[PDB]
């Protein structure tokens, strides 16, 4: 909402995936938003929520941002894919 939500990003923080210590790496992402007043590059590129993701996906790498579907999640991919976000 404050972050526009151009790319509604779906990030798994579910029970199974979360236990693998993904939280700290997604935390990187959290700060990777780094925002402005709304988002990253005052827009609202990010609209992160779990709810879509955690849907039977993990045997591929999934990262969704809106109708964009990227790879900026948790395990290091964040920083580089942040240039993408
Ligand atoms: S349950 Fe971890 S990826 Fe959609």
Curated annotation (Swiss-Prot):
It comes from Solidesulfovibrio fructosivorans (Desulfovibrio fructosivorans). [2Fe-2S] cluster binds at residues 12, 17, 53, 57. Keywords: 2Fe-2S, Iron, Iron-sulfur, Metal-binding, NADP, Oxidoreductase. GO terms for molecular function: 2 iron, 2 sulfur cluster binding; hydrogen dehydrogenase (NADP+) activity; metal ion binding. Catalyzes the reduction of NADP in the presence of molecular H(2) to yield NADPH. Disulfide bonds: none annotated. Belongs to the complex I 24 kDa subunit family. It comes from the Bacteria. Heterotetramer composed of HndA, HndB, HndC and HndD subunits. HndA and HndB could form a heterodimeric intermediate in the electron transfer between the active site of hydrogenase subunit HndD and the NADP reduction site of the reducing subunit HndC. This is NADP-reducing hydrogenase subunit HndA. The chain holds residues 87 to 171 of 171 of the full protein.
């Amino acid at each position: 909402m404050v972050p526009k939500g151009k790319y509604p990003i779906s990030v798994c923080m579910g029970t199974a995936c979360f236990v693998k210590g993904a939280d700290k790496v997604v935390h990187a992402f959290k700060e990777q938003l780094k925002i402005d007043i709304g988002d990253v590059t005052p827009d609202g590129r990010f609209s992160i929520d779990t709810l879509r993701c955690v849907g039977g996906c993990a045997l591929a790498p999934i990262v969704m941002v809106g109708e964009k579907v990227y790879g900026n999640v948790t395990p290091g991919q964040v920083k580089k894919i942040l240039a993408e976000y």
